[PDB]
Amino acid sequence: QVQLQESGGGLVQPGGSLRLSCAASGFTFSNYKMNWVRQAPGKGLEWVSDISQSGASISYTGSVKGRFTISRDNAKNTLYLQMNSLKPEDTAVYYCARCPAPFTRDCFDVTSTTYAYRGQGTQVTVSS
Amino acid sequence: QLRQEAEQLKNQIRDARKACADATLSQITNNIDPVGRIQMRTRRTLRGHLAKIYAMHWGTDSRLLVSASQDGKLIIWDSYTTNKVHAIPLRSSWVMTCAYAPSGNYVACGGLDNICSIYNLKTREGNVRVSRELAGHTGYLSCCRFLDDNQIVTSSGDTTCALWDIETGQQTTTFTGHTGDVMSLSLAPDTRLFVSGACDASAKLWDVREGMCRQTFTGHESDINAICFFPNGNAFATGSDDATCRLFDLRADQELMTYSHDNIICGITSVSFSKSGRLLLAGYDDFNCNVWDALKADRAGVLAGHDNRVSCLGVTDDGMAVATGSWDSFLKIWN
Amino acid sequence: VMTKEEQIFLLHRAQAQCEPCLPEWDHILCWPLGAPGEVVAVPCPDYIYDFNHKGHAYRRCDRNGSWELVPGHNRTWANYSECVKFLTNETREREVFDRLGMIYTVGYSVSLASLTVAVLILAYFRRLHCTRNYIHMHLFLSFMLRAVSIFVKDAVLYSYAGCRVAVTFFLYFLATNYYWILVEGLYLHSLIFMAFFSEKKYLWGFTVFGWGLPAVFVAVWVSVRATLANTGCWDLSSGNKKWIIQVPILASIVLNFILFINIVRVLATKLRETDTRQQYRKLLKSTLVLMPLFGVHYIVFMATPYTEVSGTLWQVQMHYEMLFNSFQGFFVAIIYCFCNGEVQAEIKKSWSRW
Amino acid sequence: IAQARKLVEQLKMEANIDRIKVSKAAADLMAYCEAHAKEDPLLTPVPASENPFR
Amino acid sequence: SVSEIQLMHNLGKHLNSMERVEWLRKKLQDVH
Amino acid sequence: QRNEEKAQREANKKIEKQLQKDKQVYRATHRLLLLGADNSGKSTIVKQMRIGIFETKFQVDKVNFHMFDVGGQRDERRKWIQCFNDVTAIIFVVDSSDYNRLQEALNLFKSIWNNRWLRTISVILFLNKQDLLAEKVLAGKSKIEDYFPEFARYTTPEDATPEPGEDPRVTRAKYFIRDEFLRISTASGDGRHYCYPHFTCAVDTENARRIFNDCRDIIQRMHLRQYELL
């Protein structure tokens, strides 16, 4: 079975550092263009960042460009999102979203309401 | 509490799967005589679809087949003489499915217009006319399968398999449980159960009488685009975008075997068994179909003769030939 | 200009007319009376086309009234040096004409070898049976009939039922190749200038134009030569009657050039809108491969009139023309049938399959 | 909470099935592929006398 | 002017002139 | 009896007569797919075409266009977008005013551009509600570089033809969003498919000519690629 169990998240004061880990299971991790998506309180799903099959090409939404670092570890089949600087705007639930097709650079439907290959999600909230 | 209880329920289900997984189909069937190199040649090519052929269905007599193209045509061919018995102009150009009734009296089709239109072939008037429209689905009709002249089972892109009464045109039973666009069906021989693969890597075995999901199978890693019962009806095979086909057994309830090749990185559009079920015929997106030995997972052979993506595949009820539609607007028959 | 036939007739007339020193025939002129001991001068005869007509031929009359003999011979002394002023005895055009044939005979040979294998490739492939390749097989056929008809002329006459009809085929199989290039240009120009051009609607118009319209002006030229000037194998110039073929062919070569400028003007726009240098790197590639197809070789020496053979214009033009005219069908087959993305895909597809 | 409330018994009805061994069910596919082997005109090619498509 | 036609004519006339000079040589020898 | 064979053959002659008759009509008509969002303004553009799925007809210079807007389906479009692989062009309509949603339209553009089946279809990309974009820039409350940090290092391109009475601030903004779409278009699109960006408002009396015009360029280049020119 395809399973994505995110870890990390919690309360950090603004400017804090937080390490979200997505342990994939039940598929070849090395093929799929893994993404990160988040849902603000009382707001629709939005895309945060992605990473290619081997980690070559990396993009970010721009709202978190320079503040967020994404890397994939094909050894243990894990995805990471290293947070550097947090803003109260960043309070949301982060879902570790996987690309549907295995060998394609396109990624249709990752921010969909009821996407199948997304994780359960971990609440990342920022306050003092 | 709900998340932990749901997860802990999946634990003994996974444990019972490993407990009953005593050996592997490969290990048991490693001593059987291989099917050997199978060479099927194109016997007839059917021409006259303007656009890509999206779906196709044989008749029970193994002679007439119906094909749908993305240009609003339902051409009913004569596979023996290569003649157009009928050409039905569909209201919506966008049609993703077609079924030929077991009696051959009516023919169905649907797509992005959300309606499984039934056409009456046996009208005493010159040509065919629309029998009834089936409104009630809120998603693209992926597949439509007849049970008998008055009962039709449909699938849509709104995670909804429905059973209809074509006399009243009301959705009698609705099957719910999929979390993804439902892409295909397969009715059991007795038409009491039907499996249904969806865009969530999970094929569900439905019960026609009850409307409840009897079993759910996972093991795929992407959208399931094709599904077909083993001819006895105690197993089925599925085809997904992760460039593999997995054979599942209802009574065992595991993944019996997988049909994947290192050089194949294209999804499967269509699968179908032979009449004996020994060959599995998977229609890949690399523009040709491959003939898998269902008991050894060995590539017996290849049906390479399509210019574009193979969209549909059928085997006649007597098994004497294999039709194969494609996006090159050409319907070829193999034997 | 003057036939051997005519020159024999003119000498015969002069001989019949011929039939102090006394008159006698020397085979070319009748000598008059010669004064005793005098040099006799006769104007170089009118009846000899090739003679210098400002000159005199000379004999000597004896004091004894006998034509002067050649020391140690029975021969009559004569001096024809002035008459032969415009004469020679050598070979310049002998090897030039032969070398001209030597080039294009090999030139049309590599065209025939490469085109015949090319037309079969476009023939038995059902997937390539588009209306565009339908223009190509007809154009490919034009350079084949051109390469065969020219071979026939050189073999038949340069090696009268066999020559009156061989010329007509040579002209017709040449006007069509000069016209099937126009159809190629008109077709490509109509795909780019007509807003959603109907390919199949006008496809029959091209086939009649490509093969039929050439036959309209070739046959009428035959119907004009025969009824006025039938003499010889029809390989001679009758003055301005040679413009009934050339003018309709030359009117095609200007239309291809006007169509080629229109295509290159548009293809310059398309590359600009797809960086200034990469426009050159692709515009140049597409413009050079459109030269063999459109036949813009011919526009260079289009309006050159009939010229003297030893002239440097005639020498270069024929060496330039036969070089390019012969190899066109060769260039077209490589560019449009062997360096073709679509064709190379299938040949390896059928190679890999088989 | 309601969505997950219905998930517990939906999955429970799936776990109550009388499952059998793979080995028992594996041999059934060989049994049907052997009984109907002779009747499949693609595993054993058919002479052109009774092949309608030839 | 199409080069093909012109060259054809010229070759015809070229051979005609050669025949003419061949006869001319004969007549010269006769007078000699 | 041979009577049934002739009647079967007779029907096929009449059937294939009808298919040829309707083949001319099918090939002569251009199909378009209309894409956008709730706030994109696809609804407004189809109103300008006065000359479960929604079929729009407009005739430009005696040429028929079918514009197909898909309404019924869910937000998951990775399996029904495969139907529209043989269309002339994808009319992708973007709301340039709302910068919050403008990144999502870039990802949607990227998936279409890089799709294994849509990788040969041109995109006639329309940036609607440019009127609402101008009033957003002039107010100054909404800052582009909050969403796009690269906008701080951007200048109006030299290939800019601003309309008369247009403020420089609008043109700098309205071309950064265009140029942002063309980064994806120019990254992988190599002669196979082309993007046709445009700036439309709700009060334009055009966008039918522009579709007709941009379609003619699509068909022109399709012909020229066969001739190995482009």
JSON list of C-alpha atoms in Angstrom, two decimals, chain B residues 19-158:
[
{"chain": "B", "resi": 19, "resn": "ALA", "atom": "CA", "xyz": [-0.08, -15.80, 7.10]},
{"chain": "B", "resi": 20, "resn": "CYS", "atom": "CA", "xyz": [-1.96, -17.10, 3.99]},
{"chain": "B", "resi": 21, "resn": "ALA", "atom": "CA", "xyz": [1.05, -16.16, 1.72]},
{"chain": "B", "resi": 22, "resn": "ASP", "atom": "CA", "xyz": [2.54, -19.70, 2.27]},
{"chain": "B", "resi": 23, "resn": "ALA", "atom": "CA", "xyz": [4.47, -19.62, -1.10]},
{"chain": "B", "resi": 24, "resn": "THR", "atom": "CA", "xyz": [4.44, -17.66, -4.43]},
{"chain": "B", "resi": 25, "resn": "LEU", "atom": "CA", "xyz": [2.58, -18.41, -7.72]},
{"chain": "B", "resi": 26, "resn": "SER", "atom": "CA", "xyz": [6.06, -18.23, -9.42]},
{"chain": "B", "resi": 27, "resn": "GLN", "atom": "CA", "xyz": [7.45, -20.94, -7.06]},
{"chain": "B", "resi": 28, "resn": "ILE", "atom": "CA", "xyz": [4.40, -23.30, -7.56]},
{"chain": "B", "resi": 29, "resn": "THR", "atom": "CA", "xyz": [4.21, -22.71, -11.38]},
{"chain": "B", "resi": 30, "resn": "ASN", "atom": "CA", "xyz": [8.02, -22.77, -11.93]},
{"chain": "B", "resi": 31, "resn": "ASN", "atom": "CA", "xyz": [7.84, -26.39, -13.31]},
{"chain": "B", "resi": 32, "resn": "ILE", "atom": "CA", "xyz": [4.91, -25.90, -15.82]},
{"chain": "B", "resi": 33, "resn": "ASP", "atom": "CA", "xyz": [5.59, -26.01, -19.61]},
{"chain": "B", "resi": 34, "resn": "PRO", "atom": "CA", "xyz": [6.13, -22.43, -20.90]},
{"chain": "B", "resi": 35, "resn": "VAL", "atom": "CA", "xyz": [3.64, -21.09, -23.51]},
{"chain": "B", "resi": 36, "resn": "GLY", "atom": "CA", "xyz": [6.67, -20.29, -25.71]},
{"chain": "B", "resi": 37, "resn": "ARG", "atom": "CA", "xyz": [7.06, -17.57, -28.35]},
{"chain": "B", "resi": 38, "resn": "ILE", "atom": "CA", "xyz": [3.54, -16.60, -29.55]},
{"chain": "B", "resi": 39, "resn": "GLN", "atom": "CA", "xyz": [3.22, -14.85, -32.93]},
{"chain": "B", "resi": 40, "resn": "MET", "atom": "CA", "xyz": [-0.16, -13.24, -33.61]},
{"chain": "B", "resi": 41, "resn": "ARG", "atom": "CA", "xyz": [-0.49, -11.44, -36.97]},
{"chain": "B", "resi": 42, "resn": "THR", "atom": "CA", "xyz": [-2.90, -8.60, -37.84]},
{"chain": "B", "resi": 43, "resn": "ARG", "atom": "CA", "xyz": [-5.81, -10.26, -39.74]},
{"chain": "B", "resi": 44, "resn": "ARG", "atom": "CA", "xyz": [-8.17, -7.32, -40.43]},
{"chain": "B", "resi": 45, "resn": "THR", "atom": "CA", "xyz": [-7.73, -3.53, -40.06]},
{"chain": "B", "resi": 46, "resn": "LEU", "atom": "CA", "xyz": [-10.96, -1.53, -39.66]},
{"chain": "B", "resi": 47, "resn": "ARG", "atom": "CA", "xyz": [-10.81, 2.01, -41.15]},
{"chain": "B", "resi": 48, "resn": "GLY", "atom": "CA", "xyz": [-13.29, 4.96, -41.02]},
{"chain": "B", "resi": 49, "resn": "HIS", "atom": "CA", "xyz": [-12.90, 6.55, -37.53]},
{"chain": "B", "resi": 50, "resn": "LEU", "atom": "CA", "xyz": [-11.80, 10.20, -38.05]},
{"chain": "B", "resi": 51, "resn": "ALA", "atom": "CA", "xyz": [-10.48, 10.73, -34.49]},
{"chain": "B", "resi": 52, "resn": "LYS", "atom": "CA", "xyz": [-8.74, 8.56, -31.87]},
{"chain": "B", "resi": 53, "resn": "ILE", "atom": "CA", "xyz": [-10.62, 5.39, -30.82]},
{"chain": "B", "resi": 54, "resn": "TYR", "atom": "CA", "xyz": [-11.12, 5.59, -27.03]},
{"chain": "B", "resi": 55, "resn": "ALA", "atom": "CA", "xyz": [-13.22, 2.49, -26.38]},
{"chain": "B", "resi": 56, "resn": "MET", "atom": "CA", "xyz": [-14.35, -0.70, -28.07]},
{"chain": "B", "resi": 57, "resn": "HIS", "atom": "CA", "xyz": [-16.53, -3.67, -27.10]},
{"chain": "B", "resi": 58, "resn": "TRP", "atom": "CA", "xyz": [-17.09, -7.05, -28.77]},
{"chain": "B", "resi": 59, "resn": "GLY", "atom": "CA", "xyz": [-20.53, -8.67, -29.17]},
{"chain": "B", "resi": 60, "resn": "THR", "atom": "CA", "xyz": [-21.33, -12.05, -27.50]},
{"chain": "B", "resi": 61, "resn": "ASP", "atom": "CA", "xyz": [-21.49, -13.71, -30.99]},
{"chain": "B", "resi": 62, "resn": "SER", "atom": "CA", "xyz": [-17.74, -12.90, -31.44]},
{"chain": "B", "resi": 63, "resn": "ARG", "atom": "CA", "xyz": [-18.53, -11.28, -34.82]},
{"chain": "B", "resi": 64, "resn": "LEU", "atom": "CA", "xyz": [-19.81, -7.70, -34.43]},
{"chain": "B", "resi": 65, "resn": "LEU", "atom": "CA", "xyz": [-17.81, -5.15, -32.44]},
{"chain": "B", "resi": 66, "resn": "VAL", "atom": "CA", "xyz": [-18.70, -1.55, -31.54]},
{"chain": "B", "resi": 67, "resn": "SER", "atom": "CA", "xyz": [-16.11, 1.18, -31.41]},
{"chain": "B", "resi": 68, "resn": "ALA", "atom": "CA", "xyz": [-16.24, 4.76, -30.12]},
{"chain": "B", "resi": 69, "resn": "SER", "atom": "CA", "xyz": [-14.02, 7.61, -31.34]},
{"chain": "B", "resi": 70, "resn": "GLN", "atom": "CA", "xyz": [-13.54, 11.16, -30.06]},
{"chain": "B", "resi": 71, "resn": "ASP", "atom": "CA", "xyz": [-15.59, 12.56, -33.02]},
{"chain": "B", "resi": 72, "resn": "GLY", "atom": "CA", "xyz": [-19.15, 11.47, -32.18]},
{"chain": "B", "resi": 73, "resn": "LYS", "atom": "CA", "xyz": [-19.29, 8.11, -33.96]},
{"chain": "B", "resi": 74, "resn": "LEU", "atom": "CA", "xyz": [-20.31, 4.69, -32.68]},
{"chain": "B", "resi": 75, "resn": "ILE", "atom": "CA", "xyz": [-19.48, 2.50, -35.68]},
{"chain": "B", "resi": 76, "resn": "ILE", "atom": "CA", "xyz": [-20.67, -1.14, -35.35]},
{"chain": "B", "resi": 77, "resn": "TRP", "atom": "CA", "xyz": [-18.26, -3.18, -37.56]},
{"chain": "B", "resi": 78, "resn": "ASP", "atom": "CA", "xyz": [-18.59, -6.71, -38.98]},
{"chain": "B", "resi": 79, "resn": "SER", "atom": "CA", "xyz": [-15.19, -8.25, -38.08]},
{"chain": "B", "resi": 80, "resn": "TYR", "atom": "CA", "xyz": [-15.58, -11.07, -40.72]},
{"chain": "B", "resi": 81, "resn": "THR", "atom": "CA", "xyz": [-16.39, -8.82, -43.75]},
{"chain": "B", "resi": 82, "resn": "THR", "atom": "CA", "xyz": [-15.03, -5.41, -42.48]},
{"chain": "B", "resi": 83, "resn": "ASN", "atom": "CA", "xyz": [-18.33, -3.60, -43.11]},
{"chain": "B", "resi": 84, "resn": "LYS", "atom": "CA", "xyz": [-20.09, -0.81, -41.21]},
{"chain": "B", "resi": 85, "resn": "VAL", "atom": "CA", "xyz": [-23.32, -2.40, -39.97]},
{"chain": "B", "resi": 86, "resn": "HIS", "atom": "CA", "xyz": [-24.22, 0.97, -38.32]},
{"chain": "B", "resi": 87, "resn": "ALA", "atom": "CA", "xyz": [-22.64, 4.41, -37.72]},
{"chain": "B", "resi": 88, "resn": "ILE", "atom": "CA", "xyz": [-24.27, 6.26, -34.80]},
{"chain": "B", "resi": 89, "resn": "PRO", "atom": "CA", "xyz": [-23.69, 10.05, -34.60]},
{"chain": "B", "resi": 90, "resn": "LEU", "atom": "CA", "xyz": [-23.31, 10.81, -30.84]},
{"chain": "B", "resi": 91, "resn": "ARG", "atom": "CA", "xyz": [-24.56, 14.17, -29.49]},
{"chain": "B", "resi": 92, "resn": "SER", "atom": "CA", "xyz": [-21.26, 14.85, -27.63]},
{"chain": "B", "resi": 93, "resn": "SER", "atom": "CA", "xyz": [-18.02, 14.28, -29.62]},
{"chain": "B", "resi": 94, "resn": "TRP", "atom": "CA", "xyz": [-16.30, 13.32, -26.30]},
{"chain": "B", "resi": 95, "resn": "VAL", "atom": "CA", "xyz": [-17.10, 9.68, -25.57]},
{"chain": "B", "resi": 96, "resn": "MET", "atom": "CA", "xyz": [-14.90, 7.59, -23.30]},
{"chain": "B", "resi": 97, "resn": "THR", "atom": "CA", "xyz": [-16.83, 4.29, -23.20]},
{"chain": "B", "resi": 98, "resn": "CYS", "atom": "CA", "xyz": [-19.12, 2.00, -25.21]},
{"chain": "B", "resi": 99, "resn": "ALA", "atom": "CA", "xyz": [-20.83, -1.30, -24.43]},
{"chain": "B", "resi": 100, "resn": "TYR", "atom": "CA", "xyz": [-22.61, -3.86, -26.63]},
{"chain": "B", "resi": 101, "resn": "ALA", "atom": "CA", "xyz": [-25.49, -5.68, -24.85]},
{"chain": "B", "resi": 102, "resn": "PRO", "atom": "CA", "xyz": [-25.24, -9.47, -24.44]},
{"chain": "B", "resi": 103, "resn": "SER", "atom": "CA", "xyz": [-28.44, -9.74, -26.57]},
{"chain": "B", "resi": 104, "resn": "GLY", "atom": "CA", "xyz": [-27.03, -7.22, -29.12]},
{"chain": "B", "resi": 105, "resn": "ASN", "atom": "CA", "xyz": [-30.37, -5.29, -29.11]},
{"chain": "B", "resi": 106, "resn": "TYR", "atom": "CA", "xyz": [-28.94, -2.08, -27.54]},
{"chain": "B", "resi": 107, "resn": "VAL", "atom": "CA", "xyz": [-25.59, -0.27, -27.50]},
{"chain": "B", "resi": 108, "resn": "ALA", "atom": "CA", "xyz": [-24.40, 2.25, -24.85]},
{"chain": "B", "resi": 109, "resn": "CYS", "atom": "CA", "xyz": [-21.80, 5.04, -24.69]},
{"chain": "B", "resi": 110, "resn": "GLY", "atom": "CA", "xyz": [-20.76, 7.94, -22.46]},
{"chain": "B", "resi": 111, "resn": "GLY", "atom": "CA", "xyz": [-17.94, 10.40, -21.74]},
{"chain": "B", "resi": 112, "resn": "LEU", "atom": "CA", "xyz": [-17.43, 14.03, -20.55]},
{"chain": "B", "resi": 113, "resn": "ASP", "atom": "CA", "xyz": [-21.22, 14.76, -21.11]},
{"chain": "B", "resi": 114, "resn": "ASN", "atom": "CA", "xyz": [-21.92, 12.66, -17.89]},
{"chain": "B", "resi": 115, "resn": "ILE", "atom": "CA", "xyz": [-24.70, 10.53, -19.62]},
{"chain": "B", "resi": 116, "resn": "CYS", "atom": "CA", "xyz": [-24.67, 6.78, -20.55]},
{"chain": "B", "resi": 117, "resn": "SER", "atom": "CA", "xyz": [-26.86, 7.14, -23.68]},
{"chain": "B", "resi": 118, "resn": "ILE", "atom": "CA", "xyz": [-28.52, 3.82, -24.78]},
{"chain": "B", "resi": 119, "resn": "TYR", "atom": "CA", "xyz": [-29.20, 3.46, -28.56]},
{"chain": "B", "resi": 120, "resn": "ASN", "atom": "CA", "xyz": [-31.90, 1.06, -29.85]},
{"chain": "B", "resi": 121, "resn": "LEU", "atom": "CA", "xyz": [-30.49, -0.99, -32.79]},
{"chain": "B", "resi": 122, "resn": "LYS", "atom": "CA", "xyz": [-33.75, -3.00, -33.35]},
{"chain": "B", "resi": 123, "resn": "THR", "atom": "CA", "xyz": [-35.86, 0.10, -34.28]},
{"chain": "B", "resi": 124, "resn": "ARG", "atom": "CA", "xyz": [-38.15, -0.85, -37.23]},
{"chain": "B", "resi": 125, "resn": "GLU", "atom": "CA", "xyz": [-37.36, 2.67, -38.73]},
{"chain": "B", "resi": 126, "resn": "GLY", "atom": "CA", "xyz": [-34.43, 3.09, -41.23]},
{"chain": "B", "resi": 127, "resn": "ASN", "atom": "CA", "xyz": [-31.60, 3.83, -38.73]},
{"chain": "B", "resi": 128, "resn": "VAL", "atom": "CA", "xyz": [-30.96, 3.75, -34.93]},
{"chain": "B", "resi": 129, "resn": "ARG", "atom": "CA", "xyz": [-32.31, 6.32, -32.40]},
{"chain": "B", "resi": 130, "resn": "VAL", "atom": "CA", "xyz": [-31.41, 7.20, -28.74]},
{"chain": "B", "resi": 131, "resn": "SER", "atom": "CA", "xyz": [-33.39, 4.81, -26.41]},
{"chain": "B", "resi": 132, "resn": "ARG", "atom": "CA", "xyz": [-32.77, 6.63, -23.07]},
{"chain": "B", "resi": 133, "resn": "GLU", "atom": "CA", "xyz": [-30.29, 9.07, -21.44]},
{"chain": "B", "resi": 134, "resn": "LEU", "atom": "CA", "xyz": [-28.99, 8.15, -17.92]},
{"chain": "B", "resi": 135, "resn": "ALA", "atom": "CA", "xyz": [-28.51, 11.42, -15.95]},
{"chain": "B", "resi": 136, "resn": "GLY", "atom": "CA", "xyz": [-27.49, 11.25, -12.25]},
{"chain": "B", "resi": 137, "resn": "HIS", "atom": "CA", "xyz": [-23.67, 11.01, -12.52]},
{"chain": "B", "resi": 138, "resn": "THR", "atom": "CA", "xyz": [-21.63, 14.14, -11.77]},
{"chain": "B", "resi": 139, "resn": "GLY", "atom": "CA", "xyz": [-18.32, 12.94, -13.40]},
{"chain": "B", "resi": 140, "resn": "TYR", "atom": "CA", "xyz": [-16.97, 11.72, -16.78]},
{"chain": "B", "resi": 141, "resn": "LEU", "atom": "CA", "xyz": [-18.29, 8.20, -17.54]},
{"chain": "B", "resi": 142, "resn": "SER", "atom": "CA", "xyz": [-15.15, 6.04, -17.53]},
{"chain": "B", "resi": 143, "resn": "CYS", "atom": "CA", "xyz": [-16.82, 2.70, -18.31]},
{"chain": "B", "resi": 144, "resn": "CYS", "atom": "CA", "xyz": [-20.34, 1.28, -18.85]},
{"chain": "B", "resi": 145, "resn": "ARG", "atom": "CA", "xyz": [-21.12, -2.45, -18.72]},
{"chain": "B", "resi": 146, "resn": "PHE", "atom": "CA", "xyz": [-24.50, -4.14, -19.49]},
{"chain": "B", "resi": 147, "resn": "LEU", "atom": "CA", "xyz": [-25.91, -6.85, -17.19]},
{"chain": "B", "resi": 148, "resn": "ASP", "atom": "CA", "xyz": [-29.00, -7.55, -19.37]},
{"chain": "B", "resi": 149, "resn": "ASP", "atom": "CA", "xyz": [-31.28, -5.54, -21.72]},
{"chain": "B", "resi": 150, "resn": "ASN", "atom": "CA", "xyz": [-32.72, -3.40, -18.83]},
{"chain": "B", "resi": 151, "resn": "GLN", "atom": "CA", "xyz": [-29.84, -3.20, -16.24]},
{"chain": "B", "resi": 152, "resn": "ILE", "atom": "CA", "xyz": [-26.56, -1.32, -16.84]},
{"chain": "B", "resi": 153, "resn": "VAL", "atom": "CA", "xyz": [-23.65, -0.72, -14.45]},
{"chain": "B", "resi": 154, "resn": "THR", "atom": "CA", "xyz": [-21.67, 2.51, -14.99]},
{"chain": "B", "resi": 155, "resn": "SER", "atom": "CA", "xyz": [-18.56, 4.18, -13.59]},
{"chain": "B", "resi": 156, "resn": "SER", "atom": "CA", "xyz": [-17.72, 7.93, -13.39]},
{"chain": "B", "resi": 157, "resn": "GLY", "atom": "CA", "xyz": [-14.91, 10.32, -12.43]},
{"chain": "B", "resi": 158, "resn": "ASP", "atom": "CA", "xyz": [-16.87, 11.27, -9.23]}
]
